Amino acid sequence: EEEAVRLYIQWLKQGGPSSGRPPPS
Structure with missing residues (x-):
């Protein structure tokens, strides 16, 4: 699943x- x-x-x-960056939130 190389989009999400x-x-x-x-x-x-x-x-x-x-x-310290946020992931897909």
């Missing part, structure tokens, strides 16, 4: 699980 997660992978690429 690609946004989130986008997050992770943005330093998601690192810079």
Whole structure:
């Protein structure tokens, strides 16, 4: 399901699980 997660992978690429950014919320 690389849509409802690609946004989130986008997050992770943005330093998601690192810079304190929120996932698809």
